Every structure is written in structure tokens, then in C-alpha cells.
Amino acid sequence: SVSKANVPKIDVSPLFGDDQAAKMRVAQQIDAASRDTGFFYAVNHGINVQRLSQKTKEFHMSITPEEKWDLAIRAYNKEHQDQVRAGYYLSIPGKKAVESFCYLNPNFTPDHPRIQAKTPTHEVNVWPDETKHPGFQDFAEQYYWDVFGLSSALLKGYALALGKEENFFARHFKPDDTLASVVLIRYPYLDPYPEAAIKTAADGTKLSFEWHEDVSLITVLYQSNVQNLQVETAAGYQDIEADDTGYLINCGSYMAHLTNNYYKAPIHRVKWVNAERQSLPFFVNLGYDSVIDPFDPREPNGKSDREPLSYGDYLQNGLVSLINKNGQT
Ligand SMILES: CC(C)[C@@H](OC(=O)[C@@H](NC(=O)CCC[C@H](N)C(=O)O)C(=O)S)C(=O)O
Numbered sequence: 001s002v003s004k005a006n007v008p009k010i011d012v013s014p015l016f017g018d019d020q021a022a023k024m025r026v027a028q029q030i031d032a033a034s035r036d037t038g039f040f041y042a043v044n045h046g047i048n049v050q051r052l053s054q055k056t057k058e059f060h061m062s063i064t065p066e067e068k069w070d071l072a073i074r075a076y077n078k079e080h081q082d083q084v085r086a087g088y089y090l091s092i093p094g095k096k097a098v099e100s101f102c103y104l105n106p107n108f109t110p111d112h113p114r115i116q117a118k119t120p121t122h123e124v125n126v127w128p129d130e131t132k133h134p135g136f137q138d139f140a141e142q143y144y145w146d147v148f149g150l151s152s153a154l155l156k157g158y159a160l161a162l163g164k165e166e167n168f169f170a171r172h173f174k175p176d177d178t179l180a181s182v183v184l185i186r187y188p189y190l191d192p193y194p195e196a197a198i199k200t201a202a203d204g205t206k207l208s209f210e211w212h213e214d215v216s217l218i219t220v221l222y223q224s225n226v227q228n229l230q231v232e233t234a235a236g237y238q239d240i241e242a243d244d245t246g247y248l249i250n251c252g253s254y255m256a257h258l259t260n261n262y263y264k265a266p267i268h269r270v271k272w273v274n275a276e277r278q279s280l281p282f283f284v285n286l287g288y289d290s291v292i293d294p295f296d297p298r299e300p301n302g303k304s305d306r307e308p309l310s311y312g313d314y315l316q317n318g319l320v321s322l323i324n325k326n327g328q329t
């Protein structure tokens with residue numbers, strides 16, 4: 001008795017080119033979806049998602065328990081105090097089913113100025129041994145740049161949709177300092193599936209992850225073809241159809257702040273499904289010092305009564321708050 005959510009498929013290919021009128025017609029579709037359910041599928045995006053899924057599968061099914069401890073974030077391994085964001089997030093058999101691997105900007109090297117200053121939210125990525133996972137690091141770093149390029153084009157569409165010049169968001173989204181992350185999430189098939197790893201919503205729906213708003217400017221997600229996401233609308237939680245050929249896009253709470261809730265961060269949750277599947281989000285984050293002055297496209301003078309918030313302040317506070325609300329992933 002759950003209605004299907006309206007999640008339009010938008011051909012975003014004009015956002016990579018120079019046909020300005022064509023780009024405005026894409027921007028209108030982004031505006032409409034952002035004002036409706038808050039979700040859309042970006043199609044004709046140019047990324048080889050089948051290869052992404054194959055390379056990610058090869059990694060998840062070959063990594064060993066030894067490697068997981070050696071790559072583990074601080075929540076699982078006290079020896080790794082510098083790893084708050086980047087590294088392996090272990091499962092706990094009988095208690096926690098999901099496991100994942102997160103990496104950040106490949107330009108965050110030991111010599112990067114923010115790494116030298118030990119600025120919060122910046123970390124040097126950790127990678128498994130090359131002989132054990134041949135080609136993985138190179139593939140994953142190239143994927144970061146492929147999805148960064150898609151995300152820059154999507155940000156041009158959001159800017160045009162809000163009545164701004166196309167580089168309004170994209171000028172703060174740069175290869176040398178973006179705080180964007182990739183997460184390679186594995187949701188396992190388990191027989192028997194631990195009840196401790198299943199949450200229950202107030203409406204009785206079985207979930208893997210509770211309701212939340214994303215901590216991002218926008219979220220650019222690839223998932224296997226297994227339906228699982230739900231979005232809260234006025235008519236209740238609705239099912240978001242799977243589409244393993246497109247990227248599912250939504251706004252995060254930084255976009256809601258900047259637009260004075262004109263483009264809301266949709267509240268959504270992840271249903272429990274007993275299936276072996278992948279979920280590969282790219283969280284589009286700006287730079288640490290990036291500050292966009294808030295505005296309101298519903299008001300004639302475009303002024304907002306919100307205070308400017310630096311992206312760095314937003315992000316570190318948001319990641320902690322999400323772990324406190326919905327648990328350590
Ligand atoms: C989006 C997908 C639905 C997926 O969910 C996420 O990745 C979950 N994000 C976070 O935990 C924030 C992870 C932040 C990451 N460590 C970082 O440092 O930048 C959300 O549900 S959003 C899933 O479960 O399939």
C-alpha cells in the first residue's frame with residue numbers, strides 16, 4: 001500500500017555543452033523535481049556505471065578480515081586516530097549487516113596544505129595492498145574524477161534553476177580542495193538475517209537506515225537494481241524506483257540552507273531488503289572555507305534571514321550529528 005514517488009528521468013547531457021537554451025530547459029526540470037519530491041534520476045550522464053559496479057564487486061568480495069582491520073576507521077580501530085572519515089567501516093556479524101569503504105579527494109596528499117595544518121574533515125586516503133587488489137586504487141581515484149565531472153555539470157543546472165549564473169556553486173567545487181567523498185557500500189544477503197541489524201520505523205516498515213536529511217550540497221548516487229529507498233512526501237513515505245543505469249540525485253541540507261528551504265533536503269530512509277547489493281554515493285561537498293551567502297528565490301529582493309555558514313563548519317558538525325542520530329555506519 002505504498003505509492004511510487006515521482007522521480008523523473010532528466011537527460012543532463014546538455015549541461016556538459018554550450019547550448020545555453022538547452023541548458024535552461026534542463027535547469028527547469030531540475031527546478032521542478034527539486035520543488036516536488038526532491039529526487040530525480042540523471043540519465044545520459046556519460047559514466048560507465050556497469051564497470052564501476054564490476055570493479056566495486058571485485059573489491060568487496062575479495063577484501064579479507066585482516067585487510068578490514070588494517071584499513072579500519074577509528075570507530076573500529078583505536079590505532080587509527082587520524083581516520084575519522086576515510087577507510088573501512090566494518091560489519092558486525094549478528095548485529096550490523098552493512099559494511100563500506102570511504103575515500104576522499106585524491107589530492108589530499110601528505111604535502112597538501114590542509115593535511116599539513118591538520119584541518120578537520122581532511123584526511124589522506126588509505127588503500128589496500130596493490131598486489132592483493134590490482135588496479136583498484138587507480139580505478140577508484142579515476143571514478144572520483146569522473147563523478148566530480150558529472151557533479152560539476154549538475155551544479156551548473158542547479159545554479160541556472162535558481163536564477164543564478166552557471167558557475168554559482170561550481171566555482172566553490174574545485175579539484176584542489178573539495179571535501180566530497182565516495183562511499184562503496186556493501187549490503188549483504190544473509191540467511192538468517194540478524195534481527196539486531198534491522199530497524200523498525202514508526203509505521204512498521206523494516207529499515208536498514210532511519211529517516212534523515214543528507215549532509216551535502218547535493219548527493220549523486222549509483223545503486224544496484226534492487227528497490228530500497230523511500231522519500232517522505234505530503235502523502236506519506238513513497239517508494240523511489242530503482243534505476244541502475246542512472247544516478248539518483250537529491251539535495252542535502254546545505255542546499256536547503258542556501259535557498260531558504262526553496263529546495264528542501266528531502267527526508268528519506270533505506271528499507272531493509274535481504275539482498276546482496278551495492279550503494280555508491282558521492283557526497284558533493286564544497287571546500288572548507290567555502291561560504292555562499294544565503295538567498296531566497298521566492299522573495300522579490302531575494303534576501304534571506306539566514307546567516308552565512310562555512311561549508312567546513314557545516315560538514316564537521318553534520319557528520320557527527322548524523323552518527324549520533326542514526327548510528328555509526
Ligand atoms: C546514500 C546511500 C543511501 C547510502 O547511505 C549513506 O551513505 C548514508 N550516509 C552517511 O552515512 C554519511 C557518510 C559520510 C561519509 N563517511 C563521509 O565522511 O563523507 C545516508 O543514508 S545519506 C546507503 O546506506 O545506501
Ligand SMILES: [Fe+2]
Pocket residue numbers: 212213214268
Ligand atoms: Fe541519504
